[PDB]
Design an enzyme around this catalytic site. Structure first.
Site: not given
Ligand SMILES: O=C(O)c1ccc(O)c(I)c1
Ligand SMILES: O=C(O)c1ccc(O)c(I)c1
Ligand SMILES: O=C(O)c1ccc(O)c(I)c1
Ligand SMILES: O=C(O)c1ccc(O)c(I)c1
Ligand SMILES: O=C(O)c1ccc(O)c(I)c1
Ligand SMILES: O=C(O)c1ccc(O)c(I)c1
Ligand SMILES: O=C(O)c1ccc(O)c(I)c1
Ligand SMILES: [Fe+3]
Ligand SMILES: [Fe+3]
Ligand SMILES: [Fe+3]
Ligand SMILES: [Fe+3]
Lengths: 233, 200, 233, 200, 200, 233, 200
Positions: F144, F154, F159
């Site tokens: 994105y 990115r 995460h």
């Protein structure tokens, strides 16, 4: 009593220093001229004393407390005792002796001019744990001159004696410290023909085991002769 | 081929070995418990004997800084591995030569007979390891008794030494010290009458 | 009095450590944010003090005697002071300070737990001779922990101060010992971006200068800014 | 191009500089002859002044472990290179800041005017080199006096600072201490009113 | 570490060393001035003596091509380094073994006592260097006198030899040749009673 | 209660990304300017929560069911959590969050024009087993664009948050996917100075852990700070 | 030297950390059991308090996407590591800052005293870890209480901060919220009043 249940991998007498290494002067007159006689292993050679029930003092392994605090670099000397197969050697006797920070030994025969340290003896003993780990707390010994060539200096070192499971594994050695420029110049060190073997005697700086703001740490692992079960005997 | 981890290389014990393994002799205070030269207490079963000897270099000069370790069976031909100062008998001991006289001594009992791996009996013997300054790797030898000629003649180990004259080098000579039975065992590291040393 | 006859080769500020080197914590708050202002050399900058007549004591440069004998490795640190043109710098002032064998400094602020050595101070001074040579006799200092990162240790070192012909040449540096494993981990050492520059700070073992059966020796040469005559000025 | 030998790289003095260069301060016995903060003996020609200051870090906190070296002409505008404790006036000195209050002091004389390389006179000034823990390479600066305004206006050195506001960081403020002519010179290593530092 | 230029490597002198250093012996014409075995002229002060000896190899065989160089202090224990054929005494000489008898002779005076670096007196002695075919690098030794037992017992050099029996190899036995005081000093390169050789 | 029985190997802050990394715009205003202050380890730092008794739902670790099936690449993300000594970290909490297949997060602040997925949440949690193993089932997230430079994107990432034995070991990181061409162009990734450290963040395609005709698998092992017993303290 | 395996490198949590660790906040449905900002249940022993704060960036702007983790001892100064929603007290918690106001809150009890490794008591404190977009590696800090000045003055930890002005950044200001005892702890990431961040 002990029982003849194991065999030990044969020693590589080309890895270890030979008896006659002329640069190391004293070895000339104290080395045999005849060939060693090989003998098969028997209970006599495959057994040894078990020091598990020796009454060890509380500071037997802390050279900082076993003899004021000594002067010198505070360090921890730790590592593991394993066999050639990588198997830990538990409840084995590890003994050490060394000079003080100036290269002076607490022995009647040492007349080197560096002074003795009133708080330092220089002897330790430790029984390895169930994982083959031992550790000593001492100060980093200093190099010292000796009567070999006219300007010979031993690199800083610690003398070690390890029992192992039998008289066949018993060993006496010396630990050297990473980066010491004196190493490659030593006639004793040089008694060892293979550079790679020399590396096994070099304790490595171990920042991971250091006590921040207290002492450094060196790592010295010891490999004893491999122990195997007898087979098809 | 298959190569294992190489064994840590040996190094000479050097001249100050005593400080580390023969406290008294370094002339330093000893610890509560020390491993020394008295393998048997008076009430230990067996025939109590005194062992003594000197060590010579290639020049016929006395090695006054030698250190020795001994391993032997009890009077019943049994190896007691559990080392304890409480024991009537210990199979392991240590000794060294005097800085002066340069003679070592040991107080024990005559070892019983033990069989080799093949089940054959060995003559009563004591296993010795010799260490010292000038010796890069320790020397292994055996002490046999002159009063056991019959046993000696049939020893499978003694018999491995090609030359008969060399076997003689391993036989301790009976004597008496203070009306006590003693045997003298001299080691000659190099030259004429050089003692037999083993590899195992 | 002093004469404006000389010019000094301009300093390479990329060779020397920069002011801002964050790994070295204290440098953050103690480094300028504005650029330095360049100024032409004048008599102000091209002159400096001459210490030919300072009354040095007999053991000014002997740390074994200038404070019983200290405990530690007895060594001699010697070398020569030259300029960038390789010209010797005679009669110049060389000052040094260091910790004891244990890394303990004899300074009120030093709280490290290694004990002080009753026979050791840690200060010396020497004026180079006609050939730019100097020498000191001391004990090799030990590394010591410091409050930077949670486990930072300075490599063993001797602090040095050198005056040279002018204030344009004056410099403070640190001598490190050949082979010390702690060297490459030091944030202070790393304040220097060029590893080639780091090499200039390592004293080399010098067996040729050692005193057999007594003490070892280390060689440390110093290079100051090149001095030239003014021309077509 | 031509490359000469590289100069030995600078290193911070560390917090214990005092043990080496300022003995008293280290709280240690001093030697017979030491280089200190008294450039002029009371019998020295020129106007006797006391210089004092504080050193601040970028946070506006006192730098209590700084070391300072000064170089200045005598009253005639002459540089006296031959250092001797016997001299009435020495061109070189050293001082440091209190581990407590953090102020340094210097006892000297107001320097005379010296010409630059082009024969243009410079306003009276003191050359200073600052050393300390956290300072990799020492800082060079100059101390000018506020009562030499006429001279300061025409200094070829001061005229080199592009921005007039910055020139003022180099000007010591005249005062009196115990009835003596003193000048206060604070050094601001970083930030608001950051002191001009030179490269030469 | 610091490495200097390497010393030029030694090489054996070879069997014809005489042509270069012992012309007479080579059986060739000598030059005006030659360096030989008469260190002292009749009128040189001290006890004049005759030194003689033989050199033996490992097999106990005579070494008939040896070349020797001696260095000794004068009767006053002073080293006379300015070599001159005019001098009454020269501290340096050269000699060699007869291709026949194989004995060397030197005509000198008994040396005075000199102090070692530490200020301790060494027994009177002559420094010798032996060169010959089969010897890659010359051997260094010292000749001591049997009639100086008291001094001998205290020499810092002699006492540096570990085994007393080895020290005796350095002592020359006094005799008389033609009613002249002599001392015989045989060199045993190798084996039984091998002569002590030094490194310095 | 918790006990002070361990010590953790000091972090290497040159390995980890520095605070100030200008290409990653937001780091400019969100990084300290003063140096971190180093402190000794205490029970405060050497202890942490044990999540053994948290009531984990049945699909806590399965993003395919914990929120129809989501659109995107079905994958298993598995690995082991070990310490620097190589010792497993059992019963430790592993938490994760990611975007959907189009690069859209189910977060109020996300206005990227790629649409939300009605069957996808993007959150997972898993307690590691006795051997330090964890595993998750999800869809591979899309890259994105973000407001850094005028054309910054990115790389696809997940995460991760891991607890470990103490607060000293707690870590937040990002997993990247093997071979993604966006990796070396990312200012966040580049925040990490050593390309060697970057490699530690790349999950490798794990064909052996895949479920034939169902889903692919990626292997991602995490290494926490080394845990050791205190000695000679 | 010895090198261990390298620890996995840290990465910023990013702006969407909430969907992962603060669901409610993400504006998403939560699960049965969640780790949130209520460490103590009303019937938990000790003094119940409210903790609140704001996070500022280097331009003085509020950081509205920040995420926090806390670790603290119970009122008896004992760390309760066995996390359970049934417990009256949990030593661990999580909070975040509001996208609007940008303020975080926590419901706990004032922590009891714990000793350092050397046996010295530390002042009551709360351990904090801060995560957010722009923050590559989480920041560690401690929250002390202004009403424990006596303890604070003796803290071995607080005492490690060199500059006293810097210590003040760690002290939470006591206040009241709806008649409930509260403490305000604002974090300044950069610049003026920058909060002390630790390394351990
Ligand atoms: O190992 C050697 O070099 C070696 C061994 C035995 C022996 O008799 C000789 I001569 C040399
Ligand atoms: O004097 C010697 O020869 C000597 C002394 C100490 C030591 O450790 C060694 I090896 C040799
Ligand atoms: O050298 C540097 O990195 C440097 C110098 C000046 C300055 O203001 C900054 I921000 C950085
Ligand atoms: O404590 C410090 O920061 C410290 C101590 C000694 C020293 O030589 C240095 I550089 C720094
Ligand atoms: O015959 C010999 O051995 C011989 C001859 C000449 C010479 O230079 C050498 I060296 C040896
Ligand atoms: O790490 C950096 O680059 C760094 C750290 C602190 C600081 O004040 C500055 I400007 C730069
Ligand atoms: O919009 C941004 O800056 C953004 C969004 C998602 C994400 O994971 C990161 I890191 C940054
Ligand atoms: Fe030794
Ligand atoms: Fe220092
Ligand atoms: Fe020839
Ligand atoms: Fe993201």
């Amino acid at each position: 009593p002990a029982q003849d249940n194991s065999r030990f991998v044969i020693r590589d007498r080309n890895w270890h220093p030979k008896a006659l290494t002329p640069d190391y002067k004293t070895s000339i007159a104290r080395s045999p001229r005849q060939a060693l006689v090989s003998i098969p292993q028997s209970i006599s050679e495959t057994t040894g004393p078990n020091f598990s029930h020796l009454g060890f003092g509380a500071h037997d392994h802390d050279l900082l407390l076993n003899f004021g605090l000594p002067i010198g670099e505070r360090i921890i000397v730790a590592g593991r005792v394993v066999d050639q197969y990588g198997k830990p050697v538990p409840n084995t006797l590890v003994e050490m002796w060394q000079a003080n920070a100036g290269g002076r030994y607490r022995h009647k025969n040492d007349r080197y001019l560096a002074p003795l340290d009133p708080n330092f003896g220089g002897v330790g003993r430790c029984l390895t744990d169930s994982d083959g780990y031992y550790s000593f707390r001492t100060i980093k010994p200093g190099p010292y001159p000796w009567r070999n060539g006219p300007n010979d200096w031993r690199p800083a070192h610690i003398h070690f004696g390890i029992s192992g499971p039998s008289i066949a594994t018993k060993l006496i050695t010396q630990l050297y410290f990473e980066g010491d420029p004196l190493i490659p110049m030593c006639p004793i060190v040089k008694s060892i023909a293979n550079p790679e073997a020399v590396q096994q005697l070099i304790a490595k700086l171990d920042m991971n085991n250091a006590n921040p703001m207290d002492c450094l740490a060196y790592r010295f692992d010891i490999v004893l002769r491999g122990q195997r079960k007898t087979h098809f005997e | 081929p298959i190569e294992l981890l190489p064994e840590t290389p040996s190094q000479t014990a050097g001249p100050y070995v005593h400080i580390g393994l023969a406290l008294e002799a370094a002339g330093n205070p000893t610890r509560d418990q020390e491993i020394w030269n008295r393998l048997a207490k008076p009430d230990a079963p067996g025939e109590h004997i005194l062992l003594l000897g000197q060590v010579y270099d290639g020049n016929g000069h006395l090695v006054r800084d030698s250190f020795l370790e001994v391993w032997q069976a009890d009077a019943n031909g049994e190896y007691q591995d559990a080392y304890n100062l409480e024991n009537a008998f210990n199979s392991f001991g240590r000794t060294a030569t005097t800085f002066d006289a340069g003679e070592w001594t040991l107080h024990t009992v005559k070892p019983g007979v033990v069989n080799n791996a093949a089940g054959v009996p060995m003559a009563p013997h004591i296993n010795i390891s010799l260490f010292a300054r000038g010796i890069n790797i320790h020397l292994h030898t055996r002490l046999y008794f002159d009063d056991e000629a019959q046993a000696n003649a049939k020893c499978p180990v003694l018999n491995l030494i090609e030359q008969p004259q060399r076997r003689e080098t391993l036989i301790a000579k009976r004597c008496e010290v203070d009306g006590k039975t003693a045997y003298r065992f001299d080691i000659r590291i190099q030259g004429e009458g050089e003692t037999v040393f083993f590899d195992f």
